[PDB]
Amino acid sequence: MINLKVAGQDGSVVQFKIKRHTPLSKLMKAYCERQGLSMRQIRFRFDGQPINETDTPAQLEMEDEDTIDVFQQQTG
Amino acid sequence: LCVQWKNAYALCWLDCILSALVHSEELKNTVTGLCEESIFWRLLTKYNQANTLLYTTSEIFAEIETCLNEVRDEIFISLQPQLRCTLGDMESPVFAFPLLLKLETHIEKLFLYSFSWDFECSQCGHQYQNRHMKSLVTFTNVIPEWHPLNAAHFGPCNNCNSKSQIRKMVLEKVSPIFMLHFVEGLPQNDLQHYAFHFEGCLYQITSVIQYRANNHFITWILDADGSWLECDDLKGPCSERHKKFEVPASEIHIVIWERK
Ligand SMILES: [Cl-]
Ligand SMILES: [Cl-]
Ligand SMILES: [Cl-]
Ligand SMILES: [Cl-]
Ligand SMILES: [Cl-]
Ligand SMILES: [Zn+2]
């Protein structure tokens, strides 16, 4: 697996363990369930880059103890 | 009055940044000190070449469109790999802007400010004071009395999951250009009350990116005469002069302080 930290703009930080080749959709949905957020209302960013739900940690070359940034989705 | 980019391929999330860039006095001063081969030099030179054309029928407008679209396309193609979008996608300037600044280190330095997140829980003792350096920080659920000199917001405590503790940004060294993003806008829209002094230098809001209807970005520029210029890329290539500030407080998405 691997350990990831999910940090929101409100200062919250949630730890996740995930396998290196499982897509981040399960991770995203579980973080939403803990914080009471909607998947349609938030975005994930890693190392400055947006992440799709189909992305995996290995495809984005995430290392252990890395941090994922959460933003409320505000596009145009 | 001034010229601006026209809407196409849903690029307002980029147009709003570009319009913000060309009307910054500090940036213009920096680009003309540097000495050529800059992406920002090409941006501001193509912009002024287009604005001089507007100062002077239809043939003039295609040349303006060509000058603005050429440099816009170059910037978009440079942003594309990290930002991972396909042309025609919707996106956010909160994501695009710092990636844009990293294209030129001498320009990014104009925006990099240092601060510290100061936190102290009142239910339990969890406390921290963390120093950071950013070009664009996001605020959400700010306290009503929010001010750059009292830059605080409501947040949960990571130790006890208590809500409504306060995390506060304490500015430590402010760059000549200072930008902030607000998820729900500012508490009110009288921008003069968000002016502040820091170590002897006055900082005023010189431009604002408005987030309208949760689907469209528009740039507002403060001019010398006190009037404002609205750069809604949907309203075509020319801009609009307004007697006073107009964006609803809840649509103030990105705020740019300048004047070093
Ligand atoms: Cl958040
Ligand atoms: Cl990246
Ligand atoms: Cl493509
Ligand atoms: Cl505090
Ligand atoms: Cl007001
Ligand atoms: Zn606490």
Author numbering:
A (entry chain B): 16 to 91
B (entry chain A): 225 to 259, 262 to 282, 297 to 500
List sentences quoted exactly from the publication behind this structure.
Ub/Ubl protein conjugation can be reversed by specialized isopeptidases termed deubiquitinases (DUBs) or Ubl proteases, which antagonize Ub/Ubl-mediated post-translational modifications. Moreover, we focused on recently structurally characterized USPL1, which is the only deSUMOylase with a USP fold but for which its mechanism for SUMO paralogue specificity had remained unclear. USPL1 featured an approximately 25-fold higher activity for SUMO2 over SUMO1, which suggests a much more pronounced paralogue specificity as previously assumed from fluorogenic reagents. We structurally and biochemically explain this substrate selection, as USPL1 uses the USP fingers subdomain to contact the Gly27/Gly26 loop of SUMO2/3 to discriminate against SUMO1.
Taking inspiration from Ubiquitin- and ISG15-processing USP-substrate complexes, we semisynthetically obtained SUMO activity-based probes that contain a reactive warhead at the protein’s C-terminus. SUMO2 and SUMO3 feature identical Ubl folds and differ only in their unstructured N-terminal extensions. We prepared a SUMO3–2Br probe with a 2-bromoethyl warhead as well as a ΔN-SUMO2/3-PA probe equipped with a propargylamine warhead. Both probes reacted covalently with USPL1 as evident from a shift in molecular weight and led to pronounced protein stabilization as assessed by protein melting temperature analysis, indicative of the specific recognition of SUMO by USPL1. In contrast to a recently reported SUMO-dehydroalanine probe which reacted with USPL1 but not a SENP deSUMOylase, the ΔN-SUMO2/3-PA probe reacted with both USPL1 and SENP1, but not the DUB USP2. We solved crystal structures of USPL1 in covalent complex with ΔN-SUMO2/3-PA to 2.4 Å resolution, as well as of USPL1 in complex with SUMO3–2Br to 2.17 Å resolution in a different crystal form. Alignment of three independently obtained relative arrangements of the USPL1 and SUMO folds revealed near-identical positioning of SUMO in these highly conserved areas including the SUMO C-terminus, the Pro66 loop, as well as the Gly27 loop in the fingers. Recognition of the SUMO fold through the Gly27 loop is in striking contrast to Ubiquitin and ISG15 recognition by other USP enzymes which use a hydrophobic residue (Phe4 in Ub) as well as a large, complementarily shaped surface for many water-mediated interactions. In contrast, SENP1 cleaved all substrates completely, including the G27S mutant, which is not contacted by the SENP fold. These data demonstrate that the pronounced SUMO paralogue specificity of USPL1 toward SUMO2/3 over SUMO1 is based on USPL1’s ability to specifically recognize the Gly27 loop, as a serine at this position as in SUMO1 would disrupt the water-mediated interactions with USPL1.
